[PDB]
């Protein structure tokens, strides 16, 4: 379905570092998602032709939100050209866990690990060069199928800085049946990849059962003004360059 | 000596400064580097995860989020640090305590 953009009501906020703070208003300058921007909504309402998963331009960060609960997108393949000569990365939410398979994968003409297990060997074909295989803790990701009202707001930020492939996340039990809702909830860090690979593009590997819902943000070198509370968690923020009032704030 | 004179008039003159001297020097984070035990309420020379400093590692009352290492205040200086081994939080309070003035 042709992407009908929507308004990201204060989404794409995440703890930028390891420091703890309390009741202080710190103004970080980092890659966030501009407030009230037009998110490149990949309308997965197919029950149209949302299998338009090209080599998407992986800019300096991507806000890969998803209001999906069956997790149709089990895999996320990354790379520059995806033609068997690149140290390509896969974040695969397989049966075991969120496995981080970055290797000298051998690709085919149409690069995608399609559901056939990701057995359509169009991304990975052999283990020749492999820097690190972060097989995370094996949790209850058993190819989920639950759907309905979008409880699990599967938000994710995938940035690549200094080689490090930082993957943030958050799971909020908020109920809605449509696009990104109002409210505020900052993301947490989930994994930091101590590798030095380069990524240029990526894909979204929907599970061949599609009717789903997954967005694609795009970040920018902005400056914010966070607001920490007593318990030390972000409760509010203002975009330092969005309006005159926000600027004077 | 600070007045450069052999006769001082009645008054209160500030002569020196006074800083408590740190006693020990601990090194942490061989949790999984050399190890040393936790000492409290005494000015020491701590080295937590590369972060080197001085202070009295008192007991903490604030709760960190379970991915955070450091902690700080409005003045942007280290105030609480996560114990690398036992995974606890410890405050910091430097002990550079005031000048020293002579009354004559």
Residue B45, token pair as written in the block: 């020379």
Query: Which residue of B lies nearest to A18 if distances are taken between CA atoms?
Result: B68
Question: Residues near B7 by Cβ (< 8 Å), separated by ≥ 6?
Answer: none
DSSP summary character for residue A244: H
Chain A neighbors of B62, CB-CB under 8 A: 20, 22, 232
Residue ranges covered by each domain of chain A: 6-249
Distance CA A35, CA A240 (A): 10
Query: Which residue of A lies nearest to B71 if distances are taken between CA atoms?
Result: A20
Distance CA B104, CA B102 (A): 6
CB B43 within 8 A of CB B22: yes
How far CA A229 is from CA of A209, A248, B84, in Å, comes to: 44, 22, 25
Distance (Å) from the C-alpha of residue B68 to the closest C-alpha of chain A? 5
Question: Residues near B50 by Cβ (< 8 Å), separated by ≥ 6?
Answer: none
Distance (Å) from the C-alpha of residue B45 to the closest C-alpha of chain A? 21
Residue A42, token pair as written in the block: 């990949």
Per CB distance under 8 Å, which residues of A are interface residues toward B?
A: 15, 18-22, 24, 188-189, 231-233
Chain B neighbors of A233, CB-CB under 8 A: 65
Cβ pair A188:B63 closer than 8 A: no
Q: Shortest CA distance to A13 belongs to which of A231, A233, A230?
A: A233
Query: Which residue of A lies nearest to B61 if distances are taken between CA atoms?
Result: A231
Strands A6-7 and A38-39: what pairing? antiparallel
Cβ pair A20:B64 closer than 8 A: yes
Cβ pair A188:B64 closer than 8 A: no
Chain A neighbors of B67, CB-CB under 8 A: 15, 18, 188-189
- The residue length of chain B stands at 104
How far CA A62 is from CA of A33, A37, A53, A59, A218, in Å, comes to: 9, 13, 15, 7, 5
Residue A219, token pair as written in the block: 């970040």
Chain A neighbors of B64, CB-CB under 8 A: 20, 232
Q: What is the resolution of this structure in A?
A: 3.1
CB A228 within 8 A of CB A234: yes
How far CA A223 is from CA of A219, A232, A248, B72, in Å, comes to: 12, 20, 13, 21
Which numeric CATH code is attached to A6-249?
A: 2.60.120.960
Query: Which residue of B lies nearest to A17 if distances are taken between CA atoms?
Result: B68
Query: Which residue of B lies nearest to A231 if distances are taken between CA atoms?
Result: B63
Exposed / middle / buried, residue A234 (Cβ in 10 Å: 0-12, 13-18, 19+): buried
CB pairs under 8 A between A and B: 35
Q: Return the HEC string of chain A.
A: CCCCCEECCCCCCECCCCCECCCCCCCCCCEECCCCCEECCECCCCCCCCCCCCCEECCCCCECCECCCCCCEEEEEEECCCCCCCCEEEEEECCCCEEEEEECCCCCCCCCCCCCCCCCCCCCCCCCCEEEEEECCCCCCCCCCCCCCCCECEEEEEEEECCEEEEEEECCECCCCCCCCCCCCCEEEEEEECCCCCCCEECCEECCCCCCCECCCCCEECCEEEEECCCCCEEEEEECCCCHHHHHC
Residue A79 phi, psi dihedral angles, 5° rounding: 165, 175
Distance CA B47, CA B34 (A): 11
Q: Beta-carbon neighbour count of residue A81 at 10 Å? A: 13
Distance CA A133, CA A65 (A): 25
Q: Shortest CA distance to A72 belongs to which of A1, A145, A130?
A: A145
Residue A154 phi, psi dihedral angles, 5° rounding: -75, 85
Distance CA A154, CA A157 (A): 10
Distance CA A98, CA A74 (A): 9
Distance CA A236, CA A68 (A): 25
Distance CA A193, CA A209 (A): 31
């Amino acid at each position: 379905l042709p992407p009908a953009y929507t308004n990201s009501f204060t989404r794409g906020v995440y703890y930028p570092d390891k420091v703890f703070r309390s009741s202080v208003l710190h103004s970080t300058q980092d890659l966030f998602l501009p407030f009230f921007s037009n998110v490149t909504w990949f309308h997965a309402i197919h029950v149209t032709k949302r299998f338009d998963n090209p080599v998407l331009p992986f800019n300096d960060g991507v806000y890969f939100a998803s209001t999906e609960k069956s997790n149709i997108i089990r895999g996320w393949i990354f790379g520059t050209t995806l033609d068997s000569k690149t140290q390509s990365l896969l974040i695969v939410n397989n049966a075991t866990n969120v496995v981080i398979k970055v290797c000298e994968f051998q690709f085919c003409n149409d690069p995608f690990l399609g559901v056939y297990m990701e057995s359509e060997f169009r991304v990975y074909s052999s283990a020749n060069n492999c820097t690190f295989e972060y097989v995370s803790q094996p949790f209850l990701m058993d190819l989920e199928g639950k759907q309905g009202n979008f409880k699990n707001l599967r938000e994710f930020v995938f940035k690549n800085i200094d080689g490090y492939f930082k993957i943030y996340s958050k799971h909020t039990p908020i109920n809605l049946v449509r696009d990104l809702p109002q409210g505020f909830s900052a993301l947490e860090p989930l994994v930091d990849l101590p590798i030095g690979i380069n990524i240029t593009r990526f894909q979204t590997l929907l599970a061949l059962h599609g009717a789903a819902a997954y967005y694609v943000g795009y970040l920018q070198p902005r400056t914010f003004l966070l607001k920490y509370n007593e318990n030390g968690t972000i409760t509010d923020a203002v975009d330092c360059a969005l309006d005159p009032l926000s600027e004077t704030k | 000596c600070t007045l450069k004179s052999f006769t001082v008039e009645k008054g209160i003159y500030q002569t020196s400064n006074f800083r408590v001297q740190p006693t020990e020097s601990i090194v942490r984070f061989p949790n999984i580097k050399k190890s040393t035990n936790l000492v409290k309420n005494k000015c020491v020379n701590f080295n937590f995860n590369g972060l080197t400093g001085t202070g009295v590692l008192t007991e903490s009352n604030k709760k960190f989020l379970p991915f955070q290492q450091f902690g700080r205040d409005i003045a942007d200086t280290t105030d609480a640090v996560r114990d690398p081994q036992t995974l606890e939080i410890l405050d910091i309070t430097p002990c550079s305590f005031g000048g020293v003035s002579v009354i004559t």
